[PDB]
Symmetry: D2
Subunit: 250 residues, 4 copies
């Protein structure tokens, strides 16, 4: 039987590259997405062409709310209904935007989205994944710059910190069940789509290793490692994939 | 005249020792509480008799919800109303209980643990900064064990990790306004009063320095230092007050 | 043409496991050793019988001294003598024993061996490896997942592993413009000491969340070969724990 | 009687401030120096004029060598000889200069950089503990230890070892009531020979006030850590960096 993996925010960019690579490794994949339906199905169709019936999509908002636990359980359920098992969970979906401390979304909504996507949804997904259960593991997409935060990203940053906490807490608690829990922490990877190249270049020039951002595939390479049998004693570890960015002083 | 401090969860144990010491140092104090009304108004009495018109209490639930931003705003407004100023914010209040991955709802457990330990601090910090020869500073009560978490305390631990992230992000963003943001990280201090001799002594025996818990007063002394004029260049620092506990391997 | 790797303290245990895996992946290897000559020659024999002229040994003391930089330079030279190139350096060799702060070997000697093998030799060897330079050059340093929760009375050993973190980070920063990656692999409990009794090993085993056992030398080698591989081309200055959760467990 | 402290490299700059401030708090002090006799003495003079026979000097090279152990034992002895007790040891002395990985002998650089920043603290720590209230050690660390200066691997290794010793010694010595802590400056007093523009470049990086810390600011955290207000604090390293270590590249 082929193992199966859930990847949140898999329609595009890093999530997509993670789904593709998992599929290429022989996983069946649930491609979860929020708004990006067209990209999600194009990915599913592309993947099913390679091997039939190996890819499904699954839509959900991962913003914090009283329906979030149910949403997260349903995501996990969808992998089971589709494939009869859930071997891997990748928590990749993430809201990201500034939330300045001082002077259109309300602050409670910014909390719900930024803390929901980056932390709470990963927690609920992790409970549901675990409640349902070999080489079982969770990979959380963290942030190598978490202790050198961007100006005015406090809620994003709090969310990523919480994710580190979850990574560790869940690694300890789920180890008796045989479920490993790890993280991949990008520094600068794929820059935002419509960011001017001149601004992209300020970021690239920061990276010691080749003055360039990570490809989504290079991020995905670390995830693959973490799910593989070459990482079977690795739990609670966060691998930075950052080109040395996090080592550079101001 | 006298500066003023807000201390959250100041009705008892460690928050109360912080409120007392701050008062003893010259501060007027807002004593925030949730459910501990009798103990709250009792401390305010004790303090005002010692220096009249230097303490009020302020009730608020710090669970996350859409109205939490207003409740936090009101806590800060309460300090200005009573004292015309707000120089010090101490984020001490905290829910703490297990939330295993495998009769409160999960939605409620997330609301309480993450709201009290993380979201409220962030919102308070925001309202504190928005309202602003001075020495303005914020002290967050963190946790020395945040990287060696209690088994099945994931939401609590996520919260405390987010508080680290807040401590750093807000230290960075508020430096240009002369507001310092730091933390104090206890290990084992006053043990939950619901706990037995064997388990209390189990915790005591782990602590290399004197095989005992920290006094509330020992925690408050580090707080007092960080708000003091001897910490004018300190921001974004978290000081463990843990007797070495965090250094001890399993 | 195959790449070549230097693995220090490679005669047995984790270093041998690293050398063997690098060899199976297609590397030619320099098996450095200090006292364990028989085991080293025996390892190179097996590897050469698998593919001729792919394995050599190279003896050196990695204790700190004024000639230690020449000793480290010769190790790297031996890889270039034997194979014409050096693509990978694994800093594995390590002295490990208690040095109580309150109270055999002189303190001087303790400092030299513990700091020398765990930090100073890795620094000097990193120096020679860089100085002596399709390609994928990296360095992997064998660290310790327990550096921040150290064993009682091991201050000099812990000092050295902390310095090795320092080197991993500093060297990753400084050598990135040359294309050389520098990372680390941090065991918790792996192969227990040969002289430790089974009862005490079981005590160590029972602390590990992931399976209540120590890591196999192979599990450690697996993460080394990941970091040297093309699957880790953007990774530098990262230290991967291979500890089964151990560093996460409170007292 | 009043307690005594040893402060290594106390003749100038951050160590002098640490010594003065300990003295003003009521400590008697040993002012260790290597090259700065004249300054060590001036300081001893100035302190003794305030309070008679409360301040002595002590010379030693803290470079790693076969004699380092005895030198460190002597430094601790001088405090017992001068005042009959030794309550505080501040490891402040430190060599600091670049040691590029690609091109003094390197092993002299190892001896100086590692000896000053890690081995001497370790030996003084041993002699301090051996020769035994509110006893504590305060090590001067570096808030930028994880974001190190380019070409300073050896210095950075030493300060990492110092973190290591801070933690190991706090653990091992807690049984004796001996607390072991660190103070980690970011940019404090800039190097005397650094260019004026170079200095302002570093100042500008600092979030809190775009200035360096004064030695006094550094010493303030030292004094806290030795005070009774830190009697449960061990194994802690307090940054005093104005948020410099938080700022991304
Ligand atoms: N790219 C980088 O440089 C970088 C740096 C550090 C860390 N990381 C981390 O690496 C991971 C992948 O990064 P990325 O740049 O590829 O991410 P991204 O493009 O910013 O976001 C990934 C996906 O997250 C989903 N998402 C956003 N808000 C959501 C919501 N409320 N509910 C459900 N899904 C939501 C989106 O789905 P739809 O498109 O379907 O709406 C989106 O495509 C993230 O966790 C990120 O924080 C990235
Ligand atoms: N005790 C330790 O050993 C230890 C160890 C590590 C960290 N800490 C941290 O140090 C701080 C003090 O610890 P502690 O043991 O004194 O705290 P604690 O007694 O568990 O809690 C202190 C106060 O938090 C308030 N609180 C709880 N839930 C709340 C809510 N929903 N809204 C508003 N307030 C709420 C309570 O107020 P009412 O009584 O008024 O309801 C309570 O008095 C905490 O942040 C804690 O995490 C303590
Ligand atoms: N084993 C574990 O549980 C564990 C845990 C944490 C970290 N690690 C790290 O992983 C690495 C491998 O561990 P291990 O247990 O396999 O190592 P080990 O057996 O303790 O040491 C490996 C080799 O170190 C070499 N060595 C010792 N002193 C030397 C000196 N003065 N000069 C040159 N070489 C010297 C020895 O070579 P000869 O035999 O030829 O004399 C020895 O075979 C080490 O860096 C270790 O600290 C291991
Ligand atoms: N200044 C900063 O911005 C900064 C930043 C981060 C960390 N720190 C740390 O804070 C501490 C104080 O800093 P600083 O700038 O005041 O230091 P510094 O002036 O570079 O050096 C302080 C003293 O250390 C002594 N020293 C140097 N080499 C020695 C040797 N081989 N043997 C014995 N003593 C020796 C010297 O004493 P003599 O003059 O008597 O020869 C020198 O005066 C240091 O540990 C430093 O690493 C400082
Ligand atoms: N979800 C999400 N999307 C992102 N684009 C980022 C980035 C990032 C954004 C711009 C420059 C460097 C990094 C950093 N973290 C991110 N998280
Ligand atoms: N709010 C709150 N209350 C607490 N009692 C704690 C503790 C703690 C609880 C039990 C033993 C040792 C520490 C740790 N963190 C805590 N946070
Ligand atoms: N070189 C070397 N050999 C070792 N055996 C170790 C260990 C280790 C030793 C005993 C129990 C757990 C870990 C930890 N670090 C080590 N380094
Ligand atoms: N002993 C010693 N002296 C120093 N001057 C330093 C510095 C430092 C030197 C220049 C700019 C910023 C920091 C950093 N660490 C230092 N240690």
């Amino acid at each position: 039987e082929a193992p199966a993996a859930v990847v949140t925010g898999a329609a595009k960019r890093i999530g997509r590259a993670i789904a593709v690579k998992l599929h290429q490794t022989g996983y069946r994949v649930v491609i979860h997405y929020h708004n990006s339906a067209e990209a999600a199905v194009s990915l599913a169709d592309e993947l099913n062409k390679e091997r039939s019936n190996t890819a499904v999509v699954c839509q959900a908002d991962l913003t914090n709310s009283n329906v979030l636990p149910a949403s997260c359980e349903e995501i996990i359920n969808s992998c089971f209904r589709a494939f009869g098992r859930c071997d891997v969970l990748v928590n990749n979906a993430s809201a990201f935007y500034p939330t300045p401390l001082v002077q259109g979304k309300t602050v409670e909504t910014q909390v719900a989205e930024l803390i929901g996507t980056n932390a709470i949804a990963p927690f609920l997904l992790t409970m549901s994944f675990a409640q349902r259960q070999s080489n079982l593991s969770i990979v959380n997409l963290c942030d190598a710059m978490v202790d050198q935060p961007c100006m005015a990203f406090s809620l994003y940053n709090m969310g990523k910190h919480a994710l580190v906490g979850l990574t560790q807490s869940a690694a300890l608690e789920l180890a008796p069940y045989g479920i490993r829990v790890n993280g991949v922490a990008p520094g600068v990877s794929l820059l935002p789509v419509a960011m001017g190249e001149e601004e992209k270049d300020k970021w690239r020039r920061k990276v010691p290793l080749g003055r360039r951002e990570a490809s989504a595939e290079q991020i995905a390479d670390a995830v693959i490692f973490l799910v593989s049998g070459s990482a079977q004693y690795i739990t609670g570890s966060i691998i930075k994939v950052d080109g040395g960015l996090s080592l550079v002083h101001a």
